[PDB]
Swiss-Prot record, chain A:
The record marks 215 as: Interaction with U4 snRNA. Keywords: Coiled coil, mRNA processing, mRNA splicing, Nucleus, Ribonucleoprotein, RNA-binding, Spliceosome. Residues 46-80, 149-183 form a coiled coil. Present with 1260 molecules/cell in log phase SD medium. The gene is PRP31. This is Pre-mRNA-processing factor 31. It comes from Saccharomyces cerevisiae (strain ATCC 204508 / S288c). Promotes the association of the U4/U6.U5 tri-snRNP particle with pre-spliceosomes to form the mature spliceosomal complex. Belongs to the PRP31 family. The chain holds residues 43 to 457 of 494 of the full protein. Component of the U4/U6-U5 tri-snRNP complex composed of the U4, U6 and U5 snRNAs and at least PRP3, PRP4, PRP6, PRP8, PRP18, PRP31, PRP38, SNU13, SNU23, SNU66, SNU114, SPP381, SMB1, SMD1, SMD2, SMD3, SMX2, SMX3, LSM2, LSM3, LSM4, LSM5, LSM6, LSM7, LSM8, BRR2 and DIB1.
From Swiss-Prot, chain D:
It comes from the Eukaryota. Functions as a scaffold that mediates the ordered assembly of spliceosomal proteins and snRNAs. Required for association of BRR2 with the spliceosomal U5 snRNP, and the subsequent assembly of the U4/U6-U5 tri-snRNP complex. Functions as a scaffold that positions spliceosomal U2, U5 and U6 snRNAs at splice sites on pre-mRNA substrates, so that splicing can occur. Interacts with both the 5' and the 3' splice site, as well as the branch region. Has a role in branch site-3' splice site selection. Associates with the branch site-3' splice 3'-exon region. Also has a role in cell cycle. Component of the U4/U6-U5 tri-snRNP complex composed of the U4, U6 and U5 snRNAs and at least PRP3, PRP4, PRP6, PRP8, PRP18, PRP31, PRP38, SNU13, SNU23, SNU66, SNU114, SPP381, SMB1, SMD1, SMD2, SMD3, SMX2, SMX3, LSM2, LSM3, LSM4, LSM5, LSM6, LSM7, LSM8, BRR2 and DIB1. This is Pre-mRNA-splicing factor 8. It is found in: Nucleus. The chain holds residues 751 to 966 of 2413 of the full protein.
Swiss-Prot record, chain E:
This is Pre-mRNA-splicing factor 6. It comes from Saccharomyces cerevisiae (strain ATCC 204508 / S288c) (Baker's yeast). It is found in: Nucleus. The gene is PRP6. Present with 2250 molecules/cell in log phase SD medium. It comes from the Eukaryota.
UniProtKB/Swiss-Prot annotation, chain G:
Belongs to the eukaryotic ribosomal protein eL8 family. The gene is SNU13. It is found in: Nucleus, Nucleolus. The lineage of its organism: Eukaryota, Fungi, Dikarya, Ascomycota, Saccharomycotina. Disulfide bonds: none annotated. GO terms for biological process: box C/D sno(s)RNA 3'-end processing; maturation of SSU-rRNA; maturation of SSU-rRNA from tricistronic rRNA transcript (SSU-rRNA, 5.8S rRNA, LSU-rRNA); mRNA splicing, via spliceosome; snoRNA guided rRNA 2'-O-methylation; spliceosomal complex assembly. Transmembrane segments: none annotated. Its main location: nucleus. GO terms for molecular function: RNA binding; U3 snoRNA binding; U4 snRNA binding. It comes from Saccharomyces cerevisiae (strain ATCC 204508 / S288c) (Baker's yeast). GO terms for cellular component: box C/D methylation guide snoRNP complex; nucleolus; nucleoplasm; nucleus; precatalytic spliceosome; small-subunit processome; spliceosomal complex; U4 snRNP. Binds to the C'/D and B/C motifs in U3 snoRNA. Component of the U4/U6-U5 tri-snRNP complex composed of the U4, U6 and U5 snRNAs and at least PRP3, PRP4, PRP6, PRP8, PRP18, PRP31, PRP38, SNU13, SNU23, SNU66, SNU114, SPP381, SMB1, SMD1, SMD2, SMD3, SMX2, SMX3, LSM2, LSM3, LSM4, LSM5, LSM6, LSM7, LSM8, BRR2 and DIB1. Binds to the 5'-stem-loop of U4 snRNA. Component of the ribosomal small subunit (SSU) processome composed of at least 40 protein subunits and snoRNA U3. Changing residue 57 to A: Impairs binding to U4 snRNA, but not U3 snoRNA. Causes pre-mRNA splicing and pre-rRNA processing defects.
Length: 415, 140, 143, 216, 46, 121, 124
């Protein structure tokens, strides 16, 4: 009934202990189909309550935490059997599914349906992901029958619980989506209802979402950034995540997506804040409209380019030699553009003699010229033709800055 | 181009054009509207004209229409351009052996611009002739 | 049960005395509870900055990591803490626990256990209060 | 043959002008010329030409024109390339032009290929990968190959390696007497690396560790 | 020889208004050519 | 996986190695090793290289018997190009031919048509 | 005239003082302009006090910050002018929220403390 859910919340907090949770796990298990079923039923049933949130705003983070814990436990169980699985498959439900598949046995050593199961049974698995998994298996998956049957059983139990939790979460999200046109209308208007639900659910409540700073919003719903998986897009959009898959961004060209995405994040945040501020049964949603309009305008501007330049004219060729200057100051700069004395010497070639070349492996052509003194040349080489300091390839302002930044980063890393 | 470069109507107009630009150089393409080579030249010159607006003006002329200036080439009439500064006709020695007019298409825009610049310089000096920086010989 | 209040108190303490490592530790512990489960790394960094990589803060961080069950990281943290100040107790216990959890062995630890213990370290101190040995005490703590 | 495109451009423009013999028409014509040019440019880039205010029929005509150009242009380029290969006869700027055009088409093909790949996944079916990864792994096992570790912080043969790296980079500039900007920058960087070797090493290792997004 | 486009031209003639003609979007360089020119030239400002 | 630019036309290199990255040669070689292995088979590769502790000088062997064991006498790879020198005792060759025929029918005898040959000579 | 929900609005002199502090804070890299930055500061706990803008329109983009402050026990004011605030921060553009942050070793600690006290007095 309606009264169950604070109890549920309390139960969820008892799991917040650490791995190994064993007696705790048993408790956890008890806590599971007790609570993770009734809730689902309630959700399914319409007109039980409209003020379930913010008690479901209280619970979703707890749920998330629980799921994370479960995932960790699973990894612990499996690591030393298959360490890289965690690395490769980050999503916890997905990981669980993979584990389940892996365990299955029967025709699994050759090919069940092995590489068939991943795509279908663990629905999430994309080709790239699958390939890497396969590679990992080939290298690091030990495929000797599980350390004990007990261990296997435990893992199965974990999977069952984790899966259930995931299902519950999904249900909650769905419920939120169904509601959110009432909950966070502005946000919905900005983005789209499902997206809003996803964001909001991730946050906690609307308040939680509002509290979240705009730059973070972007990378909500991102798939855990793997080192091995490729990233750079034509878009230039580092984040992806729920917002990036919105209509508001994805309709425009990929040129604009990064900037557009950024714009959306901030506006989304603003919308969320507005929603939080509002009392129930106000549904203003004028601000959101305005924001949307502005976003559209911005997009349009970004897509439109500069009007053609009036082709800049070649200057009336007059051949002025007005300048005539010098100065310790000025002569340095000009030194960089002067041919230096050694270069001048090089440019001089002795008449009768075969001139001193240097055999650069790239090209032998190079004439060392009469920079090396005859006698010197006959004997050997010279740093007398390494005279000047005023033309020693300095960096740009930009380049210098970049190098400094790099250095700073390195320093930070070292600390 | 047809739209971009201004085209002249009758010999008087041409004469006026040649006279009036005291500051700039004047490039008159004399060519029959529908010819290939002439068209190519026009296209080239369109590009150049905008670039060199500050030192040289381009104009086009239908040579079959305006027959006043068959003094300029002795009734040979290929698809030509001609160069003027202070109403003085400007001679540009290419390889071609006709120093008076370039009667051949040059494909490089930049090259064309350079030659224009050279002739402008010559004009400024007062030199009626000028030696082009590009040899040609082949086009003719 | 009250956690918001605790957080508030911690904040107040920080405002009054920022450098105090115990406050930082408390804050870290609170964070580990998992209301945020975020702004966690940043918070840790802040703590480190304020406390100047204080022995205790590092230990706390390690503990948190252990709880979360990223074990290598936790171990690293513990090592760092030890380096900062070996005499302190609870750190050793934590390290031992970590070792037990993993496949690594304790021989090295034992070898390096020549240095002191109950000079500082809360849990360790408590245990001591509750005796004369050292290895036995450690064992008890582990249990 | 290269004139053909020009002719097409002219002719089309003329037709357009004829179609609209309105007031203030010269300006309009000029504008349309630019549009025509811009569409072509877009095509060359392999950017789409989706002008918002443009009226349909005109847009269609422009598209047709660009298609025609492509038909003429690509083919022409190919022909030129063939001629060059033969060693038959070619203008000294024409060849250069072809090389640009040819380059562009290469880019277009390669980028299209990439796009296709993106659309329809990697060509390696996982079975194949398994087979070939397996082969590599077995080979490694046979060889008992100790993997190449990450360059240590205090790596033994580190400085020498760095020096070697720098020298190769330099090698290109040793000959040349002037330097453009990019070259100069590179040289400067090399100098910096040489002069602050430790710092450079630190930077490099950091990059190896962490840098996974790069100037294009 | 200019046979493929004639129909299109005719269609265009049929369709367009004067107002429409007046309000052609004076076109922007989609391939940002002038920027590129500015950049390269700057780099290779001799 | 970088953005490859060019005179106002970019793409993103999601597939196929960039040859100009200074290390890329090494990577290419490594890749080709895989292919080489595939070509040879593991055992043949082993025979060619020899044991790990004491490897072979190019085209040498530890014995005349291991040279004569497999059809692939000598193998090498100059980058993309590979060079395999097979040696068949008649019967084996015949068998191979038969197999080929079975897989890929040839009634008309238009296989000498198509077959590449060193027209330089 | 200023929004009612913008509360507490700082008195003229007080407002001026706050602005001065901000300017000092800006100079010292002790300050964090903008809603989102301010929010982040609050989350962190680094915020000493939050300075908002009454003439922020639409006001309701602001009005989470006050709530956050209340929940964190952080003094907060509104000043009247966003433009003025921006100027103080060192930004020609309208800033609406800001946070003067914590840093014990600052020269302006005392000043900051004073402002905080003033803000607290305002609240009730």
């Amino acid at each position: 009934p309606f009264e169950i859910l604070p109890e549920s919340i309390e139960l969820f907090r008892t799991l917040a202990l650490i791995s190994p949770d064993r007696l705790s796990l048993s408790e956890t298990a008890q806590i599971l189909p007790k609570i993770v079923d009734l809730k689902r039923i309630l959700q399914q049933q319409e007109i039980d309550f409209i003020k379930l949130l913010p008690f479901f705003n209280e619970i979703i983070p707890l749920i998330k935490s629980n799921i994370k814990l479960m995932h960790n436990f699973l990894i612990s169980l499996y690591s030393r059997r298959f360490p890289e699985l965690s690395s490769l498959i980050p999503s916890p439900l997905q990981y669980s599914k993979v584990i389940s598949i892996l365990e299955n046995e029967n025709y699994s050593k050759n090919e069940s349906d092995e590489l068939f199961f991943h795509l279908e049974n663990k629905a999430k698995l994309t080709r790239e992901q699958i390939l890497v998994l396969t590679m990992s298996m080939k290298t690091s998956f030990k495929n000797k029958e599980p350390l004990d049957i007990k261990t296997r059983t435990q893992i199965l139990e974990a999977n069952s619980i984790l899966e259930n939790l995931w299902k519950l979460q999904e249900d909650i999200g769905q419920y939120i989506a169904s509601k959110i046109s009432i909950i966070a209308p502005n946000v919905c208007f900005l983005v789209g209802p499902e997206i809003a639900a996803q964001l909001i659910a991730h946050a906690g409540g609307v308040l939680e979402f509002s509290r979240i700073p705009s730059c973070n919003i972007a990378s909500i719903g991102k798939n855990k950034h793997l080192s091995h998986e490729l990233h750079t897009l034509e878009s230039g959009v580092r984040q992806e995540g729920y917002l990036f898959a919105s209509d508001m961004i994805q309709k425009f060209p990929v040129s604009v997506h990064k900037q557009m995405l950024r714009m959306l994040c901030a506006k989304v945040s603003l919308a969320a804040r507005v929603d939080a501020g509002q009392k129930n049964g106000d549904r203003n949603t004028v601000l959101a409209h305005k924001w949307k309009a502005e976003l559209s305008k911005k997009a349009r501007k970004l897509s439109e380019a500069p009007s053609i330049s009036e082709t800049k004219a070649l200057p009336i060729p007059e051949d002025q030699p007005k300048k005539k200057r010098a100065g310790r100051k000025f002569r340095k700069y000009k030194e960089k553009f002067r041919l230096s004395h050694v270069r001048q010497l090089q440019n001089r070639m002795e008449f009768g003699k075969q001139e001193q070349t240097v055999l650069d492996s790239y090209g032998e052509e190079v004439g060392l010229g009469m920079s090396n003194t005859s006698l010197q040349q006959a004997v050997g080489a010279t740093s007398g033709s390494r005279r000047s300091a005023g033309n020693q390839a300095k960096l740009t302002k930009v380049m210098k800055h970049r190098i400094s930044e790099a250095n700073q980063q390195a320093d930070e890393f070292l600390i | 181009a047809s739209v971009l470069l201004p085209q002249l109507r009758t010999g008087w107009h041409v004469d006026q054009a040649i006279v009036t630009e005291t500051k700039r150089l004047v490039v008159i393409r004399f060519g029959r509207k529908n010819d290939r080579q002439c068209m190519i030249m026009d296209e080239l010159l369109s590009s150049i004209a905008e670039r060199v607006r500050n030192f040289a003006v381009i104009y086009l002329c239908d040579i079959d229409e305006v027959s006043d200036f068959d003094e300029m080439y002795e009734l040979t009439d290929p698809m030509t351009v001609m160069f003027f500064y202070h109403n003085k006709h400007m001679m540009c020695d290419f390889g071609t052996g006709n120093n008076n007019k370039l009667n051949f298409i040059v494909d490089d825009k930049q090259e064309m611009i350079d030659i224009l610049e050279t002739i402008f310089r010559g004009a400024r000096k007062n030199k009626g002739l000028v030696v082009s920086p590009y040899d040609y010989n082949h086009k003719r | 049960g009250n956690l918001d209040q605790a957080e508030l108190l911690v904040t107040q303490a920080l405002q009054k005395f920022p450098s105090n490592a115990l406050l930082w530790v408390e804050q870290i512990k609170l964070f580990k509870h998992g209301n945020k489960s975020s702004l966690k790394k940043t918070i840790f960094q802040d703590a480190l900055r304020r406390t100047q990589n204080d022995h205790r803060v590092l230990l706390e961080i390690g503990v948190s990591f252990y709880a979360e069950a990223q074990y290598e990281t936790s171990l690293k943290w513990l090592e760092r803490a030890l380096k900062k100040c070996s005499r302190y107790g609870d750190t050793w216990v934590w390290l031992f626990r970590t070792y037990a959890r993993l496949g690594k062995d304790t021989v090295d630890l034992y070898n390096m256990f020549d240095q002191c213990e109950p000079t500082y370290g809360p849990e360790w101190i408590a245990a001591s209060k509750n005796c004369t040995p050292r290895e036995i005490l450690l064992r008890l703590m582990n249990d | 043959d290269a004139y053909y495109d020009l002719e097409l451009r002219n002719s089309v423009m003329d037709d357009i002008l004829e179609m609209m013999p309105e007031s203030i028409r010269q300006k309009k014509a000029r504008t349309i010329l630019q549009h025509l040019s811009e569409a072509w440019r877009c095509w060359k880039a392999n950017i789409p030409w989706d002008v918002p205010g443009m009226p349909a029929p005109i847009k269609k005509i422009i598209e047709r024109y660009i298609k025609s150009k492509a038909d003429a242009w690509v083919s022409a380029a190919h022909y030129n390339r063939e001629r060059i290969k033969r060693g038959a006869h070619v203008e000294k700027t024409m060849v250069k032009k072809n090389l640009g055009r040819l380059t562009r088409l290469w880019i277009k093909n390669e980028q299209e290929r990439q796009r296709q790949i993106q659309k329809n996944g990697p060509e390696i079916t996982p079975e194949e990968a398994t087979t070939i990864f397996s082969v590599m792994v077995e080979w490694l096992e046979s060889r008992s190959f100790s993997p190449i570790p990450f360059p240590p912080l205090t790596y033994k043969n580190d400085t020498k390696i760095l020096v070697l790296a720098l020298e190769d980079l330099k090698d290109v500039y040793a000959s040349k007497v002037r330097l453009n900007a990019s070259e100069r920058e590179e040289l400067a960087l090399i100098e910096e690396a040489y002069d602050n070797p430790h710092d450079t090493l630190n930077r490099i290792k950091k990059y190896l560790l962490t840098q996974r997004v790069f100037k294009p | 020889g200019n046979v493929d486009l004639n129909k299109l031209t005719e269609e265009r003639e049929k369709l367009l208004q004067s107002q429409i003609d007046e309000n052609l979007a004076q076109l922007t360089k989609n391939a940002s050519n002038p920027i590129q020119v500015n950049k390269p030239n700057a780099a290779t400002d001799a | 996986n970088v953005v490859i630019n060019f005179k106002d036309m970019s793409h993103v290199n999601k597939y196929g190695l960039i040859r100009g990255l200074k290390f890329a040669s090494f990577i290419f070689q490594y890749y080709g090793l895989v292919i080489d292995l595939l070509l040879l088979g593991q055992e043949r590769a082993t025979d060619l290289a020899g044991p790990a502790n004491n490897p072979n000088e190019f085209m040498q062997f530890k014995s005349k018997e291991v040279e004569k064991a497999h059809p692939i006498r000598l193998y090498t790879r100059y980058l993309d190009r590979i060079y395999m020198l097979f040696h068949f005792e008649e019967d084996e060759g015949e068998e191979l031919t038969d197999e080929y025929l079975a897989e890929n029918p040839d009634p008309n005898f238009e296989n000498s048509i198509g077959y590449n040959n060193r027209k330089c000579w | 005239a200023p929004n009612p929900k913008a509360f507490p609005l700082a008195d003229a002199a007080l407002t001026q003082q706050i602005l001065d502090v901000v300017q000092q804070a800006a100079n010292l890299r002790q300050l964090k302009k903008g809603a989102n930055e301010a929010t982040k500061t609050l989350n962190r706990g680094i915020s000493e006090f939050i300075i908002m803008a009454a003439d922020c329109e639409p006001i309701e983009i602001l009005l989470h910050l006050p709530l956050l402050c209340e929940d964190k026990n952080v003094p907060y004011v509104f000043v009247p002018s966003r433009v003025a605030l921006g100027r103080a921060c060192g930004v020609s553009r309208p800033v609406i929220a800001a946070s003067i942050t914590t840093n014990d070793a600052s020269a302006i600690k005392t000043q900051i403390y004073a402002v905080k006290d003033k803000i607290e007095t305002l609240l009730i």
